[PDB]
Amino acid sequence: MFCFQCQETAKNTGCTVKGMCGKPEETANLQDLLIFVLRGIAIYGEKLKELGQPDRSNDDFVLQGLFATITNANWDDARFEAMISEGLARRDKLRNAFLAVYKAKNGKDFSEPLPEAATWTGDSTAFAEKAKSVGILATENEDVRSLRELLIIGLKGVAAYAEHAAVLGFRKTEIDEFMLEALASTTKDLSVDEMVALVMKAGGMAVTTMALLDEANTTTYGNPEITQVNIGVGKNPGILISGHDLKDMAELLKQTEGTGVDVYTHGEMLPANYYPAFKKYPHFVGNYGGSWWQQNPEFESFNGPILLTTNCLVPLKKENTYLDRLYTTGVVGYEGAKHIADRPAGGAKDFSALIAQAKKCPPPVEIETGSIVGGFAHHQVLALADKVVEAVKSGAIKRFVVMAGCDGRQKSRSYYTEVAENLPKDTVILTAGCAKYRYNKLNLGDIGGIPRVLDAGQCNDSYSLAVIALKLKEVFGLDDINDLPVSYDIAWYEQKAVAVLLALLFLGVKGIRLGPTLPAFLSPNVAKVLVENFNIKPIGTVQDDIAAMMAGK
Ligand code: SF4
148/134 Cα distance (integer angstroms): 14
DSSP at 335: T
- Contact between 209 and 162 under an 8 Å Cβ cutoff? The reply is yes
- Closest approach atom of ligand 1 to CA 4: 7
On whether both 159 and 38 belong to a single domain, the answer is no
Q: Which of 223, 253, 286 is the last residue of a domain?
A: 223
CA distances from 21 to 3, 28, 49 (A): 11, 11, 38
312 is annotated as contributing to ligand binding: yes
37/122 Cα distance (integer angstroms): 11
190/202 Cα distance (integer angstroms): 16
82/401 Cα distance (integer angstroms): 45
5 ligand 1 Cβ < 6 A: yes
495 ligand 1 Cβ < 6 A: no
CA of 15 to the centre of ligand 1 (A): 6
On whether both 383 and 366 belong to a single domain, the answer is no
Q: In the β-sheet with 284-287, what is the strand arrangement from edge to edge?
A: 284-287, 262-265, 238-242, 306-308, 326-329, 338-340
Give the domain extent around 202. 140-223
In three-state secondary structure terms, 337 is: coil
User: In sequence order, what E strands does 317-474 have?
Assistant: 326-329, 338-340, 371-374, 399-402, 427-431, 446-447, 450-451, 453-455
Domains in the chain, number: 4
Q: Which of 124, 139, 154 is the last residue of a domain?
A: 139
Q: What CA dihedral angle connects 526, 532, 538 and 539, to 10 degrees? A: -170
- Contact between 286 and 231 under an 8 Å Cβ cutoff? The reply is yes
361 is annotated as contributing to ligand binding: no
188/402 Cα distance (integer angstroms): 37
Residue 100, sorted as left (phi over 0), alpha (psi -120 to 50) or beta, turns out to be: alpha
Phi, psi of 457 (to 5 degrees): 135, -140
Of 163, 485, 217, 174, which Cα lies nearest the Cα of 377? 217
On whether both 539 and 414 belong to a single domain, the answer is yes
451/376 Cα distance (integer angstroms): 10
Please enumerate, as own/partner, the contacts of 139-142 that have beta carbons within 8 Å and a separation of 24 or more.
142/523, 142/525
Q: How many residues does this entry show for the chain? A: 553
CATH number of the domain within which 338 lies: 3.40.50.2030
Q: What is the per-residue DSSP string for 259-318?
A: TT-EEEE-GGGGGGGG-HHHHT-TTEEEE-SS-GGGHHHHHHHH-S-EEESSS--PPPPT
CA of 10 to the centre of ligand 1 (A): 8
On whether both 96 and 197 belong to a single domain, the answer is no
- Contact between 186 and 39 under an 8 Å Cβ cutoff? The reply is yes
Phi, psi of 548 (to 5 degrees): -65, -45
Phi, psi of 25 (to 5 degrees): -45, -50
On whether both 485 and 336 belong to a single domain, the answer is no
18 ligand 1 Cβ < 6 A: no
- Contact between 237 and 264 under an 8 Å Cβ cutoff? The reply is no
Resolution value in angstroms: 1.6
9 ligand 1 Cβ < 6 A: yes
203 ligand 1 Cβ < 6 A: no
On whether both 104 and 181 belong to a single domain, the answer is no
- Contact between 523 and 142 under an 8 Å Cβ cutoff? The reply is yes
Apex 37 CA angle, 29 and 152, nearest 5: 75
Task: Provide the greatest CA pair distance for the chain.
Answer: 74
On whether both 205 and 231 belong to a single domain, the answer is no
268 is annotated as contributing to ligand binding: yes
Q: What is the per-residue DSSP string for 127-155?
A: HHHHHTTSSGGG--SHHHHHHHHHHHHHH
Residues whose CB falls within 8 Å of the CB of residue 105, separated by 6 or more in sequence, listed in order: 51
Amino acid at 93: K
On whether both 311 and 457 belong to a single domain, the answer is no
On whether both 259 and 385 belong to a single domain, the answer is no
- Closest approach atom of ligand 1 to CA 28: 5
Cis peptide before 434 (omega within 30 of 0): no
On whether both 474 and 346 belong to a single domain, the answer is no
Of 419, 294, 434, which Cα lies nearest the Cα of 374? 434
278/283 Cα distance (integer angstroms): 10
3-class SS string, 113-134? CCCHHHCCCCCHHHHHHHHCCC
Q: Which of 164, 197, 223 is the last residue of a domain?
A: 223
On whether both 366 and 415 belong to a single domain, the answer is no
On whether both 293 and 408 belong to a single domain, the answer is no
In three-state secondary structure terms, 330 is: coil
Q: What is the distance of C-alpha 47 from the center of its chain?
A: 29
19 ligand 1 Cβ < 6 A: yes
CATH number of the domain within which 107 lies: 1.20.1270.20
Phi, psi of 383 (to 5 degrees): -70, -20
